[PDB]
Design an enzyme around this catalytic site. Structure first.
Site, PDB file in Angstrom:
ATOM      1  N   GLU A  35      14.435  -1.431  -4.031  1.00 52.14           N
ATOM      2  CA  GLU A  35      13.936  -1.671  -2.688  1.00 52.14           C
ATOM      3  C   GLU A  35      14.892  -2.550  -1.873  1.00 52.14           C
ATOM      4  O   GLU A  35      15.139  -2.278  -0.700  1.00 52.14           O
ATOM      5  CB  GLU A  35      12.561  -2.333  -2.693  1.00 52.14           C
ATOM      6  CG  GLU A  35      11.434  -1.391  -3.133  1.00 52.14           C
ATOM      7  CD  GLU A  35      11.067  -0.253  -2.190  1.00 52.14           C
ATOM      8  OE1 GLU A  35      11.668  -0.245  -1.105  1.00 52.14           O
ATOM      9  OE2 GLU A  35      10.279   0.645  -2.600  1.00 52.14           O
ATOM     10  N   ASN A  46      11.558   1.458  10.174  1.00 54.21           N
ATOM     11  CA  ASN A  46      11.117   2.820   9.936  1.00 54.21           C
ATOM     12  C   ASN A  46      10.958   3.572  11.249  1.00 54.21           C
ATOM     13  O   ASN A  46      10.862   2.993  12.320  1.00 54.21           O
ATOM     14  CB  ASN A  46       9.781   2.815   9.223  1.00 54.21           C
ATOM     15  CG  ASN A  46       9.882   2.113   7.895  1.00 54.21           C
ATOM     16  OD1 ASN A  46       9.214   1.101   7.673  1.00 54.21           O
ATOM     17  ND2 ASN A  46      10.778   2.585   7.052  1.00 54.21           N
ATOM     18  N   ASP A  48       8.435   5.172  12.452  1.00 54.79           N
ATOM     19  CA  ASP A  48       7.152   4.972  13.116  1.00 54.79           C
ATOM     20  C   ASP A  48       7.104   3.624  13.838  1.00 54.79           C
ATOM     21  O   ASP A  48       6.070   3.280  14.407  1.00 54.79           O
ATOM     22  CB  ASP A  48       5.996   5.077  12.125  1.00 54.79           C
ATOM     23  CG  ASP A  48       5.872   3.942  11.115  1.00 54.79           C
ATOM     24  OD1 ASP A  48       6.777   3.079  11.085  1.00 54.79           O
ATOM     25  OD2 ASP A  48       4.872   3.918  10.357  1.00 54.79           O
ATOM     26  N   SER A  50       7.321   0.588  12.471  1.00 55.84           N
ATOM     27  CA  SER A  50       7.085  -0.477  11.509  1.00 55.84           C
ATOM     28  C   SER A  50       8.400  -0.917  10.869  1.00 55.84           C
ATOM     29  O   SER A  50       9.420  -0.256  10.973  1.00 55.84           O
ATOM     30  CB  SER A  50       6.104  -0.030  10.454  1.00 55.84           C
ATOM     31  OG  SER A  50       6.662   0.966   9.591  1.00 55.84           O
ATOM     32  N   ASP A  52       9.955  -2.785   7.084  1.00 53.36           N
ATOM     33  CA  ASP A  52       9.805  -3.249   5.713  1.00 53.36           C
ATOM     34  C   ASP A  52      10.550  -4.575   5.502  1.00 53.36           C
ATOM     35  O   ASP A  52      11.694  -4.701   5.948  1.00 53.36           O
ATOM     36  CB  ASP A  52      10.368  -2.236   4.739  1.00 53.36           C
ATOM     37  CG  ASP A  52       9.796  -0.839   4.866  1.00 53.36           C
ATOM     38  OD1 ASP A  52       8.580  -0.740   5.094  1.00 53.36           O
ATOM     39  OD2 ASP A  52      10.597   0.140   4.709  1.00 53.36           O
ATOM     40  N   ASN A  59       5.551  -3.400   4.187  1.00 59.81           N
ATOM     41  CA  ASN A  59       5.548  -2.751   5.489  1.00 59.81           C
ATOM     42  C   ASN A  59       4.564  -3.424   6.444  1.00 59.81           C
ATOM     43  O   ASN A  59       3.452  -3.761   6.072  1.00 59.81           O
ATOM     44  CB  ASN A  59       5.229  -1.263   5.334  1.00 59.81           C
ATOM     45  CG  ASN A  59       5.425  -0.469   6.607  1.00 59.81           C
ATOM     46  OD1 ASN A  59       4.465  -0.259   7.352  1.00 59.81           O
ATOM     47  ND2 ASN A  59       6.649  -0.084   6.939  1.00 59.81           N
TER      48      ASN A  59
END
Ligand code: NA
EC number: 3.2.1.17
Length: 129
Positions: A35, A46, A48, A50, A52, A59
């Site tokens: 990750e 991301n 959309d 959002s 991380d 998220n």
């Protein structure tokens, strides 16, 4: 902070992740490696809108507030910035909520695609635990 492998294993073990919801320590170390490359300050935006955050790439759509993810939830009841600290407490405690929530560690895409089904114990091999 960029952790070493055994350093992170030790921190996660002491903070209660070994066999948390039945996921052995190596699963958590493997997930963090793929990750974030063990970097607490990692971020990823991301599609959309959002983002991380942190060593486990948690998220903002569901788990933390970053002030820029409209219509989202804050289920860990934290600013997303808490997930970037050199102190992994907030990331661990939030991870515990995530993994309890329904799809288990499948929530972490890197875990599903790169750790699940593999010899994850190799990630903690050699460490003084
Ligand atoms: Na949010």
């Amino acid at each position: 902070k960029v952790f070493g492998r055994c350093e992170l294993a030790a921190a996660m073990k002491r903070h209660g992740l070994d066999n948390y919801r039945g996921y052995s320590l190596g699963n958590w170390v493997c997930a963090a490696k793929f990750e974030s490359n063990f970097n607490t300050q990692a971020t990823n935006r991301n599609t959309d809108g959002s983002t991380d955050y942190g060593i486990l790439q948690i998220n903002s759509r569901w788990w933390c507030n970053d002030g820029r993810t409209p219509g989202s939830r804050n289920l860990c009841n934290i600013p997303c910035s808490a997930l970037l600290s050199s102190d992994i407490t907030a990331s661990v405690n939030c991870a515990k909520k995530i993994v309890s929530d329904g799809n288990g560690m499948n929530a972490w895409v890197a875990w599903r695609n790169r750790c699940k089904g593999t010899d994850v114990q190799a990630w903690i091999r050699g460490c003084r635990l």
